[PDB]
Amino acid sequence: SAVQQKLAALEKSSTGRLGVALIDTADNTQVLYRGDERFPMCSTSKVMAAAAVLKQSETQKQLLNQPVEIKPADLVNYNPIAEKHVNGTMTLAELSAAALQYSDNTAMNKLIAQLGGPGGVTAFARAIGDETFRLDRTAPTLNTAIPGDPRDTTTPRAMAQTLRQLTLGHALGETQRAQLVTWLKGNTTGAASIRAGLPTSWTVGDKTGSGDYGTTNDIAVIWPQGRAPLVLVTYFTQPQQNAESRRDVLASAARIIAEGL
């Protein structure tokens, strides 16, 4: 397709490896670029952990209101919210919001721990039919993004399908699904990524990620005007370990999609 050709041109010009999956829910068509290759998720994996905790809350009724102690040993590399509550508590709802909306890595580790470790996050993915996602490490090391390493990876196609099931489909109960969508719409870290390639009148929920190798990721549910919602995954990684982040490349991928489909 013409969109695939433009994504290939974008990838070649940008000097990296680009993975894109678009689902258009108006007609369930899919546009993929390297859609079945594995990419490091980086912090985009926080969506799966938050969703798995919401799933737990369907049977543990007010689990989201439970206080969780934040201890010094919990702090990692980037903890903009949790660092204000060390030797205190945050609820699981507060940890989920911090993880999703600020990409707080300590908050993510509390979610992972609440699920029984990275294997528990992966088990949730399997339970909703995602056979591709794998979470193998906690924060911060899940973001190393070393080429050739299959840990903490998924494919664009699998992640787009899962994000659709979580936000638009039936993987979560109605209250939980609404809560996930509210959290994603409130993300603070995505203004330069997929959102920057879309008209400002469209509504977006997204979760970013970044890591070594200039890895720059974003996954989004988009509610345009005038048409049904879209699900878009954009993953990008580069050959040099200390390559600079390219959020603008993701914005350009989103613009190609939003103009071409």
Least CB distance from residue 154 to ligand CAZ, whole Å? 14
Nearer to ligand CAZ, 6 or 246 (CB): 246
Query: Is residue 144 part of the contact set for ligand CAZ (CB under 6 A)?
Result: yes
Q: What are the residues whose beta carbons fall under 8 Å from the beta carbon of 204, sequence distance 6 or more?
A: 185, 190, 194, 195, 198, 220, 221, 222, 223
Query: Is residue 189 part of the contact set for ligand CAZ (CB under 6 A)?
Result: yes
Q: How many chain residues interact with ligand CAZ (CB under 6 A)? A: 17
Query: Is residue 109 part of the contact set for ligand CAZ (CB under 6 A)?
Result: no
For the window 38-57, what string marks contact with ligand CAZ as x by the rule CB under 6 A?
Answer: ----xx--------------
**Among the listed residues 96, 122, 165, 208, the single contact to ligand CAZ using CB under 6 A:** 208
The CA distances from residue 90 to 105, 123, 167, in Å, are 14, 25, 25
Stretch that binds ligand CAZ, among 20-28, 53-61, 86-94, 141-149 (CB under 6 A): 141-149
Q: What are the residues whose beta carbons fall under 8 Å from the beta carbon of 233, sequence distance 6 or more?
A: 19, 20, 21, 22, 156, 159, 160, 163, 218, 219, 220
Q: What are the residues whose beta carbons fall under 8 Å from the beta carbon of 157, sequence distance 6 or more?
A: 21, 30, 32, 35, 36, 132
Q: What are the residues whose beta carbons fall under 8 Å from the beta carbon of 217, sequence distance 6 or more?
A: 39, 40, 41, 42, 43, 44, 208, 209, 210, 234, 235, 236, 250
Query: Is residue 122 part of the contact set for ligand CAZ (CB under 6 A)?
Result: no
Stretch that binds ligand CAZ, among 154-162, 171-179, 202-210, 229-237 (CB under 6 A): 202-210
Nearer to ligand CAZ, 13 or 241 (CB): 241
For the window 66-85, what string marks contact with ligand CAZ as x by the rule CB under 6 A?
Answer: -----------xx-------
Stretch that binds ligand CAZ, among 110-118, 140-148, 166-174, 232-240 (CB under 6 A): 140-148
For the window 209-228, what string marks contact with ligand CAZ as x by the rule CB under 6 A?
Answer: xxxx----------------
Rounded Cα gap, residues 194 and 233, in angstroms: 9
Catalytic site residue 43? Answer: yes
Residue from 43, 103, 193, 245 carrying the catalytic annotation: 43
Nearer to ligand CAZ, 141 or 175 (CB): 141
Q: Cite the active site residues.
A: 43
Interacting residue ranges for ligand CAZ, rule: CB under 6 A: 42-43, 77-78, 103, 105, 140-141, 143-144, 189, 208-212, 245
